[PDB]
Ligand binder design. Structure first.
Ligand SMILES: *[C@H](C)[C@H]1/C(=C/C2=NC(=C\c3[nH]c(C[C@H]4NC(=O)C(C=C)=C4C)c(C)c3CCC(=O)O)/C(CCC(=O)O)=C2C)NC(=O)[C@@H]1C
Ligand SMILES: *[C@H](C)[C@H]1/C(=C/C2=NC(=C\c3[nH]c(C[C@H]4NC(=O)C(C=C)=C4C)c(C)c3CCC(=O)O)/C(CCC(=O)O)=C2C)NC(=O)[C@@H]1C
Ligand SMILES: *[C@H](C)[C@H]1/C(=C/C2=NC(=C\c3[nH]c(C[C@H]4NC(=O)C(C=C)=C4C)c(C)c3CCC(=O)O)/C(CCC(=O)O)=C2C)NC(=O)[C@@H]1C
Ligand SMILES: *[C@H](C)[C@H]1/C(=C/C2=NC(=C\c3[nH]c(C[C@H]4NC(=O)C(C=C)=C4C)c(C)c3CCC(=O)O)/C(CCC(=O)O)=C2C)NC(=O)[C@@H]1C
Ligand SMILES: C=CC1=C(C)[C@@H](Cc2[nH]c(/C=C3N=C(/C=C4\NC(=O)[C@H](C)[C@H]4CC)C(C)=C\3CCC(=O)O)c(CCC(=O)O)c2C)NC1=O
Ligand SMILES: C=CC1=C(C)[C@@H](Cc2[nH]c(/C=C3N=C(/C=C4\NC(=O)[C@H](C)[C@H]4CC)C(C)=C\3CCC(=O)O)c(CCC(=O)O)c2C)NC1=O
Ligand SMILES: C=CC1=C(C)[C@@H](Cc2[nH]c(/C=C3N=C(/C=C4\NC(=O)[C@H](C)[C@H]4CC)C(C)=C\3CCC(=O)O)c(CCC(=O)O)c2C)NC1=O
Ligand SMILES: CCC1=C(C)/C(=C/C2=NC(=C\c3[nH]c(/C=C4\NC(=O)[C@H](C)[C@H]4CC)c(C)c3CCC(=O)O)/C(CCC(=O)O)=C2C)NC1=O
Ligand SMILES: CCC1=C(C)/C(=C/C2=NC(=C\c3[nH]c(/C=C4\NC(=O)[C@H](C)[C@H]4CC)c(C)c3CCC(=O)O)/C(CCC(=O)O)=C2C)NC1=O
Ligand SMILES: CCC1=C(C)/C(=C/C2=NC(=C\c3[nH]c(/C=C4\NC(=O)[C@H](C)[C@H]4CC)c(C)c3CCC(=O)O)/C(CCC(=O)O)=C2C)NC1=O
Ligand SMILES: CCC1=C(C)/C(=C/C2=NC(=C\c3[nH]c(/C=C4\NC(=O)[C@H](C)[C@H]4CC)c(C)c3CCC(=O)O)/C(CCC(=O)O)=C2C)NC1=O
Lengths: 161, 160, 206, 98, 92, 407, 164, 177
């Protein structure tokens, strides 16, 4: 659980040296985007339910995962999805603010693909839901902010694959 | 034994052994010469301690050997004395270990489940061990009879 | 930046997650003894002899064992003119009795990896009951007359499997005799005549 | 008081045992029973167990007698293992959440 | 003390999990399992990881293994990491 | 000048052993000189005779029942009128040296056997053999050995007093002259009836051909491969029995090598080799965090020195002094002993142990992939999804041949 | 003669080294065993005539074919040269019990003897039948002491091993 | 070579007698002072390389002609070889004192030595003196009367072993005379 400042301090500390010009050079780069990330995390908090409603209706709302037998069939199973998609849109918001994807694999990625295989959750439909959820998130926060929030979505999709 | 559970006691408490624990491991090993003599007496007296043990057991509990009793006939009576040979053996372990830890996890833990599941009256086997105790303590002096009898009555307590 | 980095998170971290993969306590992936050997495709007579002889229940157990399972070329190498004397009699279907000890001499209580045998000579008895000397010198390990082929195979219960080149026979193992004829003395007067009388023992007679 | 369970902070910080394991071993510790077991009655020990290993009070009368008889027969090591091994622990806290 | 005092059916403490663990047992397993909660959709509590691998003692593995299946869990692998086998004395 | 003079110059006046033989592998094992005394007990004449039969016959079974032509050449030596040089010349002219190492031997196998038997070394270069080839073919074998032991080599390094031995001479004039040495004198077990294969080609172990290996190494400049110089090897016999942290003794070759085990091991020894070259540039200055303040904490601490024992009384207590060379710098017993514990605790040495440990595991795993077509494989690993493809269609490396049909 | 002292200052001469602490420590064992191996040196010397008589006719007891004509032990001048030869071998055992090595045996009884007994057609199995009679006549508390008998019956089957 | 035990056996082999109790009282006195003989060889080889430099440089300050130009200890090659043959001889006396018999000294070291030094141009009478300095140091170290190093000993007598090593040093002196 490290942000961009924590990761910069760790690497500069792990060699026992002070924060030289290169370490502060990245820190200044993070502070420049500090204004963009909060407004990105602002609108995502507002439209959390709307984004997840848009992703599932655009990716896996009508294809066979929903029909009996597929999976989301039962209401407990459908309700687990939007609960499950809420974490991806939420933890991706944390990575967008912290500027470092360490929180994702610390709290989301580890034991995740090993868990879906246990339950039998389709990893293929899961990533496309997150990809569609990444597509709507670029709608709200804009282009570059969508590039930032989108940079952690595919990090989840990559490791979850 | 006293050595293994004085360790696992101080093991759980994240500490070493106190003088109270190490002056007794010390006191127990100097006691070890006298313990082997006591267990050596019961070792080759099992012929009398068991056979006279089942002597008083049948005179005090003729139901268990009478027709309908659990130890009825030539067969069950042989096994009727076999268990007494077991428990007499475990008392020799407890005397040398200086504790009922050998008797605890052998012949005591879950003993009521076995004898209830075998149809044997558990109170009857408790009477058998008491009859062995009077024979055992009659074979030793007063200083020893406070030990050899001491392990039997623990087995009597846990067996009811 | 140091090469042997480490695990953890937060400050004082090297950029590598805990446990190198974010798992502190990793679930194992090995199988047990007899089907780690079943997957190897070389211990075929070994796993089959275990299943028939009933020894395979023993090396099912969770105790840390160090099996010295011989590859079937070792079993195929049992056609010595010498070793066929002391081992062919086990092929008979009633002599499962000795087959369990001879197989039980290959199980060693403890997890002795080859790296743990750096120029060390330590003995131990098997689960058969008789001592065996494991010797590791000059990067070549030995278990009796083993001359181990493959170094180690990690198994389920912290157990190790070494591939040996031959079959270790226990030290005080005598081969079972072949099934014979119960012979009886034809006469009775050829045996009273075979016993020395008391008058013979004192030299009173020839 | 400068107390220390270095072995338990070991086996939980590495993930060798759960928080539930670390909590159960804390309950069967001797610094616990000197604190919340020795000065009290088996009656009062049962209620003080629920505040600690369940985060709530006893609910009914039969929930007392089930858990008093367990403590009545197995003491502290039998009671805390019967709370940590219940379903109500697992529904709220399984292996990771204090 | 131990869990086999004589309790069975028709006894005063309620019929429950009875483990064959000795006095202060020192055997413990290394288990691995997933256990979906099956109760979050009417309680709406926060979510916790259900795939765990941990060392449970021999004194309470049976209760835990009996309970992991109570709530539909699946046990992927268990081992006896610490302790002996067929050991009369010494499990303490 | 660490070594003043080699072994080929004689030992001058002031040493009992030559300077190269002190710190080589001469002193460890049984390849020493057993030089004859002036007058000696017939037991001590048997000691110098048994070393001659070990050396000039090369652990051959001399079959003491016969000793047919031997006992005339023995009795010239037991009188004393035959030198040890003249005994070892006369043994190399007999029939039982000819029927072992000449009647079945190639003239490469014979010259390389006379270098091991008569001299100590191996043949160094090519034209060193080409002298002894042309000297045999024009003068014969009896005038070969007479022209072989009476050059400038034997009379300096053994004289006429000592028997020959394997000359671990330290300075080797090609570097392969140590490699062909240990490949010829093959350990304490192997004899030259075995090494040349004269028994297995023999008709009932008799009158077989003494064929030779290493003929490709004397023609072209090509080193001996390392398995013949490390496994069946006299360095195992004169082994120091150290704790050598890269262990030089090669592991026995494993059955069932897999390509999946090698292809991660080659990536691991490229990982350590690229990380060693980074960490060795930062050594000894920037890895020492206490080094930067040594210029100041060495002049801050040069105040109120105490000449006898006793002062720094500090308000009236004892608190004395140590005044040695060590504790005037404040160091302890844990301050010079920190050099002995620099295998685990170091960083540059942490890489170079596992570099040579895993390259030594690589060089016996890769060399065990000289067996291809009928070899039964196995899968000791859990058959994971990691797999390199078989994409070997077109040219990927293509070593630069700029003269493709240049004519 | 190969002894304790002569084998430890020959190897020290072979290295070009002073007598070190390993060389002195080997000769400390020469002082410890000499209380036993000289008690068998004076017990054998005092009774060498009855031992060589009782072992001489044990040679001809097992091998009674030697008194046939054409053989080695045919007439009385050759049997008298036989009992001298067992007396030489019992003299060298008393010689090599005093020295402490096999020095008197390896120089005066062993070396070249495998060529002499082939040349004069002497049966070496009849020598080792007479020595092994003395090895099994040895009563360990009666003939000598216990460790003197171990020192005496270690040197006789050195002579049995090198002959056959 | 022989020792103190294999001397009396080959003396008894010339008369073909068994080694009985008339001869065994002289050998059981050899193992009686076996501890003093090991305490005497240890006192010499512990001070061995400083005994020869005491003696070779003690020869130079008594006769300064050896380090004159064209002498025989003038060159560093000749001075270092003179220390070499000083400690060869002191090694070979300490074999003979260890064996208690001179039959390792007279045939491995002394045999052919006088004929060697005439062939090398080594002056003989100065090498008598370098041996005779070591004869004073061998009887001083064995009797523990060295004036600047006393070694630890259990107290008693060594005038036999000091005389025994002094008989071995003028065997070297009589050989190269
Ligand atoms: C066949 C090429 C031979 C031949 C074979 C026969 N053997 C018969 C009986 C027999 N063979 C053995 C030895 C074998 N059985 C073993 O268990 C083991 C190893 C321990 C070996 C090597 C035994 C012990 C017996 C039984 C002895 C007896 O009862 O006499 C046999 C007769 C029985 C049958 O045919 O089933 C035959 C024909 N005999 C031949 O003439 C050819 C050359
Ligand atoms: C030193 C900077 C190395 C190192 C060297 C060691 N070399 C050892 C033996 C040895 N070295 C050579 C090389 C050299 N000698 C030659 O004669 C020639 C060419 C004609 C060359 C270039 C040779 C051939 C040998 C073997 C000779 C012998 O040992 O007798 C050595 C001793 C190992 C041992 O005694 O077992 C060492 C330690 N070691 C180092 O760590 C640095 C890198
Ligand atoms: C009698 C039990 C033997 C036996 C003895 C014969 N030995 C004959 C000759 C002989 N033996 C030796 C070896 C012996 N002499 C020594 O001086 C020493 C030790 C220093 C030993 C061990 C020698 C050297 C000789 C030849 C000269 C000699 O006669 O002494 C011998 C005469 C054979 C002949 O003249 O053809 C006999 C009969 N032979 C037997 O029957 C049993 C085995
Ligand atoms: C020093 C106290 C002498 C002296 C000695 C010199 N000796 C020179 C060469 C040399 N020395 C010996 C003696 C030594 N070597 C042995 O092997 C043994 C006995 C086992 C002994 C006593 C020998 C044999 C040789 C010749 C062989 C060699 O080179 O070592 C020598 C060098 C002469 C030169 O370089 O021209 C010297 C100076 N000379 C003295 O003045 C005092 C008396
Ligand atoms: C060099 C070594 C050495 C010896 C072996 C004896 C040698 C020796 N002891 C006996 C003689 C004897 N030796 C024994 C002793 C025994 N008889 C047995 O059957 C038992 C095995 C054993 C009892 C322990 C007895 C009882 C006699 C007298 C009768 C006999 O010859 O057997 C004889 C036969 C002539 C005689 O009676 O003296 C000889 C040569 N002395 C020695 O100096
Ligand atoms: C011109 C120079 C010159 C010398 C250097 C001395 C050399 C010298 N020293 C000793 C005599 C001796 N020399 C030594 C040798 C040594 N003492 C030790 O303790 C060390 C081990 C070793 C020196 C490193 C010993 C032990 C004695 C016997 C007396 C003694 O020192 O206690 C003797 C013979 C007896 C005597 O003369 O008193 C001589 C000639 N004399 C000289 O004229
Ligand atoms: C391996 C190496 C090795 C040794 C070095 C010797 C060590 C040694 N020296 C003596 C023992 C002795 N050493 C001496 C000798 C002397 N005392 C003097 O005062 C004189 C100066 C000097 C005479 C040369 C004497 C007199 C004794 C005691 C008498 C005796 O033991 O016989 C003893 C017997 C006493 C004891 O138990 O310590 C031993 C073991 N032995 C060994 O095994
Ligand atoms: C914070 C990191 C984190 C994640 C991501 C997580 C996931 C997780 N998803 C679960 C179930 C589930 N997840 C799904 C999801 C899906 N079905 C589909 O078809 C889609 C592809 C997908 C929605 C995108 C379903 C249907 C279940 C219920 C499975 C069942 O009842 O068997 C469960 C079982 C228990 C429960 O839901 O109460 C866990 C623990 N836990 C975590 O700690
Ligand atoms: C070391 C601890 C230990 C004990 C005690 C033990 C008991 C034990 N008692 C048994 C049987 C038995 N035990 C009895 C005993 C009795 N009948 C009476 O009347 C008396 C009251 C009483 C004996 C004093 C009888 C009759 C049987 C046979 C029951 C049957 O055949 O159904 C059996 C089944 C047969 C056997 O395997 O022996 C066991 C295992 N095992 C143990 O390991
Ligand atoms: C009772 C048996 C037992 C042992 C031995 C044990 C070890 C153990 N050592 C640990 C860490 C550690 N251990 C070390 C040790 C070392 N660093 C070095 O350079 C040295 C070579 C070595 C000291 C000798 C370090 C530095 C950590 C912290 C690692 C980290 O923060 O990533 C951890 C992680 C959790 C924690 O410490 O709280 C455990 C569980 N647990 C046990 O139950
Ligand atoms: C509901 C499904 C289910 C089963 C079946 C189950 C079995 C189970 N059997 C156990 C032990 C045991 N089981 C046995 C059984 C036997 N010994 C024999 O010789 C016979 C072949 C066999 C009786 C048929 C024994 C002796 C132990 C104790 C082992 C020990 O103390 O090491 C244990 C260890 C803990 C304990 O008993 O408290 C468990 C968890 N758990 C479950 O949840």
């Amino acid at each position: 659980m490290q942000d961009a400042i924590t990761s910069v301090i760790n690497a500069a500390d792990v060699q026992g040296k002070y924060l030289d010009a290169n370490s502060v050079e990245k820190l200044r780069g993070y502070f420049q985007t500090g204004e963009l990330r909060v407004r990105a995390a602002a609108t995502i908090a507002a439209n959390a339910a709307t984004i997840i409603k848009e992703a599932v209706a655009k990716s896996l709302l009508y294809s066979d995962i929903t029909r009996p037998g597929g999976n989301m069939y039962t209401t407990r199973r459908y309700a687990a999805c939007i609960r499950d998609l809420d974490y991806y849109l939420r933890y991706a918001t944390y990575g967008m603010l912290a500027g470092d994807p360490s929180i994702l694999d610390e709290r989301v990625l580890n034991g995740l693909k090993e868990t879906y295989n246990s339950l039998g959750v389709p990893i293929g439909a899961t990533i496309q839901a997150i990809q569609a959820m990444k597509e709507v998130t670029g709608s709200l926060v804009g282009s570059d902010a969508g590039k930032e929030m989108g940079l952690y979505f595919d990090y989840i999709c990559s490791g979850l694959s | 034994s006293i050595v293994t559970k004085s360790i696992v006691n101080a093991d759980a408490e994240a500490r070493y052994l106190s003088p109270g624990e190490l002056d007794r491991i010390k006191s127990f090993v100097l006691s070890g010469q006298r313990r082997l003599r006591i267990a050596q007496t019961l070792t080759e007296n099992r012929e009398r301690i068991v056979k006279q043990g089942g002597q008083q057991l049948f005179q005090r509990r003729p139901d268990v050997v009478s027709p309908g009793g659990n130890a009825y006939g030539e067969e069950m009576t042989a096994t009727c004395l076999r268990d007494l040979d077991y428990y007499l053996r475990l008392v020799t372990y407890g005397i040398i270990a200086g504790d009922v830890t050998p008797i605890e996890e052998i012949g005591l833990v879950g003993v009521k489940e076995m004898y209830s599941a075998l149809g044997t009256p558990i109170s009857g086997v408790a009477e058998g061990i008491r009859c062995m105790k009077d024979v055992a303590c009659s074979l030793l002096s007063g200083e020893d009879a406070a030990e050899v009898g001491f392990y039997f009555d623990y087995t009597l307590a846990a067996m009811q | 930046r140091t090469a042997y980095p480490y695990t953890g998170s937060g400050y004082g971290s090297a950029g590598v997650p805990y446990g190198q993969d974010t798992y502190g306590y990793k679930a194992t992936t090995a199988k047990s003894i007899t089907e780690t050997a079943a997957q190897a495709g070389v211990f075929n007579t070994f796993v089959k002899l275990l299943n028939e002889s009933g020894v395979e229940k023993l090396v099912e157990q969770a105790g840390p064992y160090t099996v010295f399972a011989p590859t079937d070329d070792a079993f195929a190498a049992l056609l010595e003119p010498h070793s066929f004397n002391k081992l062919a009699t086990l092929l008979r279907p009633e002599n499962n009795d000795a087959l369990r000890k001879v197989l039980m001499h290959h199980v060693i209580p403890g997890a002795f990896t080859s790296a743990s045998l750096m120029d060390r000579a330590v003995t131990v008895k098997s689960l058969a009951g008789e001592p065996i000397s494991i010797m590791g010198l000059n990067k070549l390990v030995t278990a009796g007359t083993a001359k181990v082929v493959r170094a180690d195979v990690p198994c389920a219960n912290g157990c190790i499997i070494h591939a040996v080149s031959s079959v270790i026979i226990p030290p005080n193992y005598v081969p079972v005799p072949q099934p014979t004829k119960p012979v009886f003395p034809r006469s009775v007067i050829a045996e009273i005549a075979k016993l020395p009388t008391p008058r013979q023992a004192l030299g009173l007679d020839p | 008081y400068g107390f220390s369970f270095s072995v338990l902070e070991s086996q939980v910080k590495n993930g060798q045992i759960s928080i539930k394991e670390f909590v159960r071993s804390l309950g069967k510790s001797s610094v616990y029973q000197k604190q919340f077991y020795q000065p009290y009655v088996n009656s009062r020990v049962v209620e003080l167990a629920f505040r600690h290993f369940l985060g709530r009070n006893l609910s009914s009368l039969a929930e007392f007698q089930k858990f008093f008889a367990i403590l009545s027969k197995k003491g502290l090591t039998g009671l805390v293992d019967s709370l940590i091994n219940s379903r109500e622990y697992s529904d709220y806290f399984n292996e990771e959440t204090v | 003390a131990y869990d086999m005092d004589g309790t069975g059916a028709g006894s005063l403490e309620p019929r429950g999990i009875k483990s064959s663990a000795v006095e202060k047992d020192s055997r413990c397993f290394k288990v691995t399992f997933v256990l979906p909660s099956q109760s979050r959709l009417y309680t709406f509590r926060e979510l916790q990881n259900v795939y765990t691998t941990k060392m449970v003692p021999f004194s309470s593995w049976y209760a835990e293994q009996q309970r992991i299946q109570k709530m539909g869990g699946k046990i992927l692998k268990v081992e006896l990491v610490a302790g002996g086998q067929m050991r009369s004395v010494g499990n303490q | 000048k660490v070594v003043d003079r080699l072994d080929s110059q004689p030992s001058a006046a002031f040493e009992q052993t030559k300077q190269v033989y002190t710190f080589s592998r001469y002193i460890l094992g049984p390849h020493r000189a057993v030089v004859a005394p002036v007058a000696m007990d017939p037991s001590e004449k048997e000691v110098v005779l048994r070393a001659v039969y070990r050396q000039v016959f090369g652990n051959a079974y001399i079959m003491e029942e016969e000793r047919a032509e031997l006992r005339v050449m023995e009795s010239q030596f037991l009188l004393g009128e035959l030198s040890v040089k003249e005994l070892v010349r006369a043994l190399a002219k007999s029939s039982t040296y000819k029927v072992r190492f000449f009647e079945g031997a190639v003239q490469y196998r014979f010259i390389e056997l006379c270098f091991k038997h008569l001299l100590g070394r191996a043949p160094d270069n090519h034209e060193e053999i080409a002298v002894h080839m042309r000297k045999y073919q024009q003068e014969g074998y009896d005038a070969e050995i007479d022209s072989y032991l009476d050059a400038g080599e034997y009379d300096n390094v053994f004289g006429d007093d000592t028997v020959p031995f394997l000359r671990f001479r330290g300075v080797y004039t090609p570097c392969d002259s140590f490699n062909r040495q240990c490949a010829l004198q093959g350990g304490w077990a192997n004899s030259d009836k075995a090494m040349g294969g004269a028994a297995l080609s023999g008709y009932n172990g008799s009158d077989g051909r003494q064929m030779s290996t290493m003929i490709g190494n004397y023609i072209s400049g090509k080193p001996i491969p390392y398995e013949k110089v490390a496994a069946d090897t006299p360095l195992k016999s004169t082994a120091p029995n150290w704790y050598a942290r890269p262990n030089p003794a090669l592991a026995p070759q494993p059955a069932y090598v897999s390509a999946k085990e090698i292809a991660e091991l080659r990536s691991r020894v490229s990982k350590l080799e690229a990380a060693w070259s980074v960490a060795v540039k930062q050594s000894a200055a920037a890895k020492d965090t206490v080094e930067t303040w040594r210029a100041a904490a060495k002049e801050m601490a040069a105040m109120r020195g105490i000449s006898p024992m006793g002062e720094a009384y500090f308000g009236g207590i004892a608190q004395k002094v140590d005044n040695g060379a060590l504790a005037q710098l404040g160091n302890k017993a844990s301050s010079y002993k920190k050099y002995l514990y620099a295998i685990e605790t170091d960083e540059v040495s942490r890489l170079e142990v596992d570099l040579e440990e895993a390259k030594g595991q690589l060089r016996v795993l890769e060399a065990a992939m000289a067996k291809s077509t009928p070899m039964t494989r196995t899968a000791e690993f859990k058959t994971l999804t990691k797999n390199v493809a078989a994409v070997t269609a077109a040219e990927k490396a293509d070593p630069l041949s700029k003269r493709p049909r240049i004519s | 003669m190969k002894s304790v002292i002569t084998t430890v200052v020959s190897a020290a001469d072979a290295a070009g080294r002073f007598p070190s602490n390993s060389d002195l420590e080997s000769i400390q064992g020469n002082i410890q065993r000499s209380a036993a191996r000289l008690e068998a040196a004076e017990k054998l010397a005092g009774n060498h005539e009855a031992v060589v008589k009782e072992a001489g006719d044990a040679c001809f007891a097992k091998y009674a074919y030697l008194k046939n004509p054409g053989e080695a032990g045919e007439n009385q001048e050759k049997i008298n040269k036989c009992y001298r030869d067992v007396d030489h071998y019992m003299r060298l055992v008393n010689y090599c019990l005093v020295v402490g090595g096999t020095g008197p045996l390896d120089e005066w009884g062993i070396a070249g003897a495998r060529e002499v007994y082939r040349t004069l057609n002497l049966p070496t199995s009849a020598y080792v039948a007479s020595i092994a009679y003395t090895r099994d006549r040895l009563c360990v508390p009666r003939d000598m002491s216990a460790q003197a008998g171990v020192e005496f019956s270690a040197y006789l089957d050195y002579l049995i091993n090198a002959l056959s | 070579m022989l020792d103190a035990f294999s001397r009396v056996v080959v003396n008894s082999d010339a008369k073909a007698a068994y080694v009985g109790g008339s001869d065994l009282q002289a050998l059981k006195s050899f193992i009686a002072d076996g501890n003093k003989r090991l305490d005497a060889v240890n006192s010499i080889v512990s001070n061995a390389s400083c005994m020869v430099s005491d003696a070779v440089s003690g020869m130079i300050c008594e006769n300064p002609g050896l380090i004159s130009p064209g002498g025989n200890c003038y060159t560093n090659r000749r001075m270092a070889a003179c220390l070499r043959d000083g400690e060869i001889i002191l090694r070979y006396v300490s074999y003979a004192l260890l064996a208690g018999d001179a039959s390792v000294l007279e045939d491995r070291c002394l045999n052919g030595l006088k004929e060697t030094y005439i062939a090398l141009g080594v002056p003989t009478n100065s090498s008598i003196r370098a041996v005779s300095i070591m004869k004073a140091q061998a009887v001083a170290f064995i009797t523990n009367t060295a004036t600047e190093r006393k070694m630890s000993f259990a107290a008693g007598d060594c005038t036999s072993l000091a005389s025994e090593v002094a008989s071995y040093f003028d065997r070297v002196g009589a050989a190269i005379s």
